[PDB]
Amino acid sequence: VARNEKQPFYGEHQAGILTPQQAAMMLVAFDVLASDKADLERLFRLLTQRFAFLTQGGAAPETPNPRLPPLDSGILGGYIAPDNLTITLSVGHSLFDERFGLAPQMPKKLQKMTRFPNDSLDAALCHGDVLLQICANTQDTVIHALRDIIKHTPDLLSVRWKREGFISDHAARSKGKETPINLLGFKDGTANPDSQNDKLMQKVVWVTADQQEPAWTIGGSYQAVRLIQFRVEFWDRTPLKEQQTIFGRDKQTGAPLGMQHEHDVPDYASDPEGKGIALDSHIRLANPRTAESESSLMLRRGYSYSLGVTNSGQLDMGLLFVCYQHDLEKGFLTVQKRLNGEALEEYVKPIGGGYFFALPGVKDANDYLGSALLR
Amino acid sequence: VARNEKQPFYGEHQAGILTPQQAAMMLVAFDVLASDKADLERLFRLLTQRFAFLTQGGAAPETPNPRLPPLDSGILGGYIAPDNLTITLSVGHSLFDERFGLAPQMPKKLQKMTRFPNDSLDAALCHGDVLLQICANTQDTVIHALRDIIKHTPDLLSVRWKREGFISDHAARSKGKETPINLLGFKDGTANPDSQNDKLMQKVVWVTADQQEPAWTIGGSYQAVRLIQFRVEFWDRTPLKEQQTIFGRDKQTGAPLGMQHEHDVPDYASDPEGKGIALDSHIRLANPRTAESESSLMLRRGYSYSLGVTNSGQLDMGLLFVCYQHDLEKGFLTVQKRLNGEALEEYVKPIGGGYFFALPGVKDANDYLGSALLR
Numbered sequence A, B: 001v002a003r004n005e006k007q008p009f010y011g012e013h014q015a016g017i018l019t020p021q022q023a024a025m026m027l028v029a030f031d032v033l034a035s036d037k038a039d040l041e042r043l044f045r046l047l048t049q050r051f052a053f054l055t056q057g058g059a060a061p062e063t064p065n066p067r068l069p070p071l072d073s074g075i076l077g078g079y080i081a082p083d084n085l086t087i088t089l090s091v092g093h094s095l096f097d098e099r100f101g102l103a104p105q106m107p108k109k110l111q112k113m114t115r116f117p118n119d120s121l122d123a124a125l126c127h128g129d130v131l132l133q134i135c136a137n138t139q140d141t142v143i144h145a146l147r148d149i150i151k152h153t154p155d156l157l158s159v160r161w162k163r164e165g166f167i168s169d170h171a172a173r174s175k176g177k178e179t180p181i182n183l184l185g186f187k188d189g190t191a192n193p194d195s196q197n198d199k200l201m202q203k204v205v206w207v208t209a210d211q212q213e214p215a216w217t218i219g220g221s222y223q224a225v226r227l228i229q230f231r232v233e234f235w236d237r238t239p240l241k242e243q244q245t246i247f248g249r250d251k252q253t254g255a256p257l258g259m260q261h262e263h264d265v266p267d268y269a270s271d272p273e274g275k276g277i278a279l280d281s282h283i284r285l286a287n288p289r290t291a292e293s294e295s296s297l298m299l300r301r302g303y304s305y306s307l308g309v310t311n312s313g314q315l316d317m318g319l320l321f322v323c324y325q326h327d328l329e330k331g332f333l334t335v336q337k338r339l340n341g342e343a344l345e346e347y348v349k350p351i352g353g354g355y356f357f358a359l360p361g362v363k364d365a366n367d368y369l370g371s372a373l374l375r
């Protein structure tokens, strides 16, 4: 039964990273209003409490005294089903400024996101002290979580930016067995590293003790977020041949061009002029598939978005790109540097997002998010 | 299983009016680019063809030569499942201007929406020559339909404004049996007239021969749409007693204040002074429940929406209000007139929408949307 699905909240790592993608999600960044490290700890403790309750489900908080605001928004009714909810907390570069004495604690590669050559960043949609990635089976559960978090933090958190996204229900319900199709009509996720292989994930996604990082970071992950708008109508009137040449993949099957099966692996060595798969194609640049490029593997966990219209009255739709990696410089920064100038660029418009560090897991009810960071 | 569900497209009435609410929907208004009535008829025939196909589902059309833009967006894959899709077409006041010589044919009560006292109308989110209400089990189906429609009308339609909405998955699944909860946390739909009652619908919703209307409108219905933004955070810190006094209903049970069941009928006659349910409460203003006021009954079919963050840092969430009635003046205009200045206004803010006339049904494949209107 879908509404009763739960992902464990406690663990060595946060959920929402390796977790198979649920159908609905939200990215919401906040300014932190805490004035002391003390206030910050109270906030982190409070958040852990709210996330623990929401993700595992229970009866909605009641309001015995009606002269008070309702203790729950009510939008789910009387029972708060877990509905496969995960909440992942990450912290931005700006949390490590003067306010809370955490500067010495900053992850070695964490930085403020700065624009790439194809960027049109909107200042209202960038950065933040903290980001929550909130995913569940249904949008109702995600919004209810947000409203709960907000009601509990008037003194501590102020919403900075928010965007909601989705993947198809049936792809979500296959728990990774079927690749989601993005709003350009291409399968998106095919070449992701196996999130179930724990040794691969220890190398690819998680910060490990062997890295040159502050101790508290161990078991967390660097997180790059990009809000990317599509030129939908322009894309839809583009020849199929060109769409495929831009990506490097067959639209229908998802296979690398020239091959038969979605998950087949291209051989770039036997195609040095890119007659088969173009040298400026998205996948060839994202992953050159050389011995040296293997250090730039990442776990992508992106969602589609659809809003209203743009300022030109064209459809506002795109990608909430999210990726996790053991090292921000070796992962996202390296890959995007390779992607600069790719054929796709004229079709997409990065307008927002930022870089964050996803905290390590919370061990149990006596622990709280950020405990190692704050001590 | 849900993907395979179909709603009939052909009928005396259009689907999507009496149809039980699906989980996902979109309102999309267009400017019509047709220059002639001849072009107008070409568009209407074209739309009928796209709607007939999309609602019943089938193989996605293939692209015979990759030099051609894809014949389908591909966002659903190789098969276009019906997924309970309905598409309802309505025409705005502006369609009856000098372009197509339809002035003599205009429904007596059709008019350009003008602001009510509490409105902050955004010009870009108002009016339109035509409006499509596109509803389905899932958002992917709805977006796919839109892209298909757009693909086939480059010379004929321009998107004017668009908003997508939802009701909860489970309320949606009970197919009308359980009332959707809106984003203020109140059950929303309780007092709707019974859409399965044919004689009642003929009275309340459908235009009938007796009305002083052009013959073509028979079997159509006046449609009022309001895009309404909620001050969600402010609402959430408002005492529950106050939330309830504003509506006239118990938030938890949805019953009229002082009664037991959600669907109990208030006895206003026994409370002439409004000590139980306030005289200026939402429901009592909306429906005085006198035999006289029955001319103002309507069928509401509204959806929640959730977008981003306003420039003042508040969540942009609210209601896509849609209602159907035999007479726009007797229904919505009369009801909103009673509502003007209600206490709810301090929590809500109309910003867009419009008045339209939903056309009569299409009889079979030999008929087309708006055939009576265009003859």
Ligand code: HEM
Residues within 6 Å of the ligand: A182, A184, A186, A187, A188, A189, A190, A191, A192, A226, A228, A247, A249, A282, A283, A284, A286, A287, A298, A319, A321, A332, A335, A336, A339, A348
């Ligand atoms: C701009 C909008 C984007 C779209 C529409 C898009 C779509 C796709 C598609 C269709 C694929 C092929 C299927 C797959 O292997 O998942 C792909 C692969 C990939 N993408 Fe993107 N992507 C976008 C942005 C990005 C960004 C910003 C990055 C990293 C900075 C990125 C990194 C990757 C990587 C590493 C692969 C796997 C390539 C391989 O190993 O063969 N993508 N993307």
Ligand code: HEM
Residues within 6 Å of the ligand: B182, B184, B186, B187, B188, B189, B190, B191, B192, B226, B228, B247, B249, B282, B283, B284, B286, B287, B298, B319, B321, B332, B335, B336, B339, B348
């Ligand atoms: C502005 C945001 C609005 C919200 C949050 C809202 C919500 C509600 C709620 C919770 C109810 C009680 C349950 C029910 O019977 O459905 C209700 C009833 C009703 N509403 Fe509203 N509504 C809004 C706007 C409107 C507008 C603009 C109209 C028409 C102009 C309208 C017309 C009605 C009617 C006719 C009823 C049934 C009352 C009865 O028969 O007892 N509502 N609404």
